[PDB]
Amino acid sequence: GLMAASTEGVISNKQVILKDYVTGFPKESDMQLTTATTKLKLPEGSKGVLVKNLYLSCDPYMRSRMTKREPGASYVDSFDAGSPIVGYGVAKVLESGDPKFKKGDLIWGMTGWEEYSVITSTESLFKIQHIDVPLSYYTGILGMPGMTAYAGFYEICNPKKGETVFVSAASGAVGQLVGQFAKLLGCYVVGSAGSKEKVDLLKNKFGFDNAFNYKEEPDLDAALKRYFPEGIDIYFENVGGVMLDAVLPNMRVHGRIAVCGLISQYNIAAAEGCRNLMYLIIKQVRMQGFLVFSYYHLYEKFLEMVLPAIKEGKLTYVEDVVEGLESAPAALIGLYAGRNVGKQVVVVSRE
Amino acid sequence: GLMAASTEGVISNKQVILKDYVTGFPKESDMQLTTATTKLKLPEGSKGVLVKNLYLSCDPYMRSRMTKREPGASYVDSFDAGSPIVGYGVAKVLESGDPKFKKGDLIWGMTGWEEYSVITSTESLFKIQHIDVPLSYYTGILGMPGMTAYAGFYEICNPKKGETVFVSAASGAVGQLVGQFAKLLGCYVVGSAGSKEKVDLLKNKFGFDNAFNYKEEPDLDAALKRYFPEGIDIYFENVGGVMLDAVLPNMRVHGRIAVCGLISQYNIAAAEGCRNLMYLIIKQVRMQGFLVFSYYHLYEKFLEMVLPAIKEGKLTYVEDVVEGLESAPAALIGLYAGRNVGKQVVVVSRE
Ligand SMILES: NC(=O)c1ccc[n+]([C@@H]2O[C@H](COP(=O)([O-])OP(=O)(O)OC[C@H]3O[C@@H](n4cnc5c(N)ncnc54)[C@H](OP(=O)(O)O)[C@@H]3O)[C@@H](O)[C@H]2O)c1
Numbered sequence: 001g002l003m004a005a006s007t008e009g010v011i012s013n014k015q016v017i018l019k020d021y022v023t024g025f026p027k028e029s030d031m032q033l034t035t036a037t038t039k040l041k042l043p044e045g046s047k048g049v050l051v052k053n054l055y056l057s058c059d060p061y062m063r064s065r066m067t068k069r070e071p072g073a074s075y076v077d078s079f080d081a082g083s084p085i086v087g088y089g090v091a092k093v094l095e096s097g098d099p100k101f102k103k104g105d106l107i108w109g110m111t112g113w114e115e116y117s118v119i120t121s122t123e124s125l126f127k128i129q130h131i132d133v134p135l136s137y138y139t140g141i142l143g144m145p146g147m148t149a150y151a152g153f154y155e156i157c158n159p160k161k162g163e164t165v166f167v168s169a170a171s172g173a174v175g176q177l178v179g180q181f182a183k184l185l186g187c188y189v190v191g192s193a194g195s196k197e198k199v200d201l202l203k204n205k206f207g208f209d210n211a212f213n214y215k216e217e218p219d220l221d222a223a224l225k226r227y228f229p230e231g232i233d234i235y236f237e238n239v240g241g242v243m244l245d246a247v248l249p250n251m252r253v254h255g256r257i258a259v260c261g262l263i264s265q266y267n268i269a270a271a272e273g274c275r276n277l278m279y280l281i282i283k284q285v286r287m288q289g290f291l292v293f294s295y296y297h298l299y300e301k302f303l304e305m306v307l308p309a310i311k312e313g314k315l316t317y318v319e320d321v322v323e324g325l326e327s328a329p330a331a332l333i334g335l336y337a338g339r340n341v342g343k344q345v346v347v348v349s350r351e
Numbered sequence: 352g353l354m355a356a357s358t359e360g361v362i363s364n365k366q367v368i369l370k371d372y373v374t375g376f377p378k379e380s381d382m383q384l385t386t387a388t389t390k391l392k393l394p395e396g397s398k399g400v401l402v403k404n405l406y407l408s409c410d411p412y413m414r415s416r417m418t419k420r421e422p423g424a425s426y427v428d429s430f431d432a433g434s435p436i437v438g439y440g441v442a443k444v445l446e447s448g449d450p451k452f453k454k455g456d457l458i459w460g461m462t463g464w465e466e467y468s469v470i471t472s473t474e475s476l477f478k479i480q481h482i483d484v485p486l487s488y489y490t491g492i493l494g495m496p497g498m499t500a501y502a503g504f505y506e507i508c509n510p511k512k513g514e515t516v517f518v519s520a521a522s523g524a525v526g527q528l529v530g531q532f533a534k535l536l537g538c539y540v541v542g543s544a545g546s547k548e549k550v551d552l553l554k555n556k557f558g559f560d561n562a563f564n565y566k567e568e569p570d571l572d573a574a575l576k577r578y579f580p581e582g583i584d585i586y587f588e589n590v591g592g593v594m595l596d597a598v599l600p601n602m603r604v605h606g607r608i609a610v611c612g613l614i615s616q617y618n619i620a621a622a623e624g625c626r627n628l629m630y631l632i633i634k635q636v637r638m639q640g641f642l643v644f645s646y647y648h649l650y651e652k653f654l655e656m657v658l659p660a661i662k663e664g665k666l667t668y669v670e671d672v673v674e675g676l677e678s679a680p681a682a683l684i685g686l687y688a689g690r691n692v693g694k695q696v697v698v699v700s701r702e
């Protein structure tokens with residue numbers, strides 16, 4: 001077989017399309033791998049960038065964008081059926097209408113699930129300077145998940161030396177950093193995760209004081225009392241559901257719950273009830289939700305702290321890396337089954 | 352018929368006894384009116400007071416004390432089966448072992464459901480000085496409920512001029528004050544209550560901007576959008592249950608929920624689930640429980656503000672007054688049916 005090159009400079013652009021809006025849990029077959037065509041040229045008048053995508057993030061929030069809604073009651077618009085999935089990634093600039101960015105610069109920000117994207121505005125892109133770390137880190141510890149852990153722990157939890165900290169989904173992109181931040185502060189830290197592998201990772205890689213497999217614990221209250229005989233000062237909440245109900249009676253007086261996520265609720269049409277809210281009164285607890293995008297003014301301050309800590313080996317990170325856009329649908333769905341061990345990354349292209 | 356006076360100075364002391372611990376909703380027949388005897392003499396060595404009870408408070412928390420528990424996981428010990436109900440009241444000192452208190456002084460604090468009580472310690476009693484108000488006010492606006500409204504609204508809600516405020520159980524002991532405090536601050540204030548009488552009281556007596564009868568609203572979300580077309584900055588939560596679920600999607604960004612009470616949950620063995628907690632994240636809401644007893648250091652500051660406001664007619668109060676200890680069981684149970692119109696008081700004796 002033989003394929004002539006295009007005399008109009010057309011090349012192939014593989015894409016992951018959302019075929020149609022999703023009800024309940026997403027399936028691989030809700031997405032379609034396709035091959036489009038592109039002339040690698042920016043639209044006339046573009047103030048944006050034409051990029052080659054290198055790495056894509058799989059992030060839990062992305063399921064919410066697969067449900068059809070009008071712009072509102074969500075912080076962000078639905079995906080468009082028939083168009084590529086969009087999400088955070090790391091890309092190389094091919095052409096720019098903004099002279100801040102030149103060919104060969106590396107960026108992170110919202111991009112398409114495709115080999116090549118046009119991003120119409122640069123105002124929400126970050127130009128990468130420090131490349132003495134794996135570039136995939138700018139989807140996790142040096143991107144949106146790392147900023148989430150930094151904001152949620154240091155700005156919402158009011159953490160103090162000697163406090164007790166519980167983290168759910170603790171081996172994941174956000175949780176693995178919260179627990180390290182807490183350990184470095186001098187807190188007692190425990191995490192919950194969904195397998196022996198992830199429990200062992202918490203104790204051995206991340207230095208949590210203890211951890212347990214929630215899927216093997218018939219009695220979550222008894223598990224939390226095993227590790228917190230005098231209660232929990234801070235709950236960093238990533239999951240919601242039965243774990244939140246089990247936590248509430250185990251909070252300390254003036255305890256805090258940072259409500260980062262509620263991933264156990266993301267795929268069911270009607271959420272489970274939280275039943276132990278009386279303990280917010282009895283223990284005088286502050287339960288506070290937050291959105292990372294309200295804290296990006298702190299990003300440069302965050303990088304000034306975390307880059308040298310990674311270099312010094314004070315902070316570490318575990319990524320789950322899968323190869324190719326072809327892998328991306330299964331990697332995204334896998335978040336809701338705990339398939340990922342650490343932060344889920346898709347490698348579209350290393351260069 | 353003829354009854355000789357006792358040659359040992361014994362007199363009759365009517366009491367309301369808890370016959371046995373309560374499961375589910377309390378009944379009048381869970382309590383027993385009885386006549387004991389007393390020699391109005393303090394025990395040898397007593398550092399406390401012998402008092403004549405004048406007024407008793409019916410307060411929602413009292414149901415929790417009718418369930419048997421070990422000392423813990425509740426901020427206070429169960430009632431004793433076979434002994435008088437205890438709760439906040441207003442009393443006259445007959446005899447004292449503490450010379451701070453003399454015969455004829457008026458106090459408020461925790462006392463027995465009886466004509467005469469021995470209170471073993473004075474450390475938690477307040478000696479009343481200002482008697483140019485109804486003495487019953489020291490069970491409500493000048494007692495524990497008034498302190499609750501002051502602390503919860505001014506210390507937990509971070510209220511600001513022009514903010515939107517929603518109050519549940521808004522015609523009750525606490526809620527009727529929160530809404531007045533909010534109106535005086537320049538907030539837009541709406542309240543929910545369980546009857547037309549109480550709705551009309553909110554608009555006409557307390558100057559709320561609006562109010563509605565939750566028992567007549569099939570769609571609580573639609574009712575809240577009627578009164579809050581741009582959402583709720585502060586929810587002062589007294590009820591929990593379906594009202595909390597309806598509020599959450601109607602919160603404004605950086606909205607606050609002061610969790611004072613959850614009375615819809617007090618009598619059912621398993622609480623209803625709160626299902627809309629995702630909105631704590633989407634709207635970045637602070638949902639914070641508190642206990643009035645952590646704020647009694649502010650009581651003298653509270654009285655310096657509220658006494659002149661009551662005298663000037665800036666603040667008003669509505670009490671539901673029933674006559675006699677014989678009325679007390681039905682008045683207490685009535686709280687869980689909304690029988691009370693305003694703060695529920697029992698008159699044991701006017702002097
Ligand atoms: N507020 C914000 O701005 C913000 C930003 C970023 C992330 N978040 C939230 O933070 C949380 C963590 O995100 P992440 O990126 O770090 O994800 P992640 O932990 O790397 O991956 C998701 C993990 O969720 C766990 N999980 C999935 N379904 C579950 C269920 N039904 N019950 C309990 N655990 C379940 C799984 O771990 P196990 O194997 O341990 O079950 C899975 O590996 C998510 O809720 C996300 O939405 C919020």
Ligand SMILES: NC(=O)c1ccc[n+]([C@@H]2O[C@H](COP(=O)([O-])OP(=O)(O)OC[C@H]3O[C@@H](n4cnc5c(N)ncnc54)[C@H](OP(=O)(O)O)[C@@H]3O)[C@@H](O)[C@H]2O)c1
Nearest residue numbers: 411520523524525544545589611612613614615642643689
């Ligand atoms: N955190 C603290 O330190 C503290 C201190 C004091 C009080 N509190 C709490 O504050 C709340 C109000 O106390 P309060 O003394 O002012 O009581 P209150 O409002 O004077 O009386 C209770 C009222 O609750 C309402 N209610 C009863 N069952 C209900 C249900 N199933 N659904 C909805 N509403 C229901 C009724 O009003 P409607 O006719 O309008 O239904 C009833 O009149 C209570 O939850 C109490 O426990 C907390």
Ligand code: NA
Nearest residue numbers: 162163164233
């Ligand atoms: Na501690």
Ligand code: NA
Nearest residue numbers: 513514515584
């Ligand atoms: Na407002």
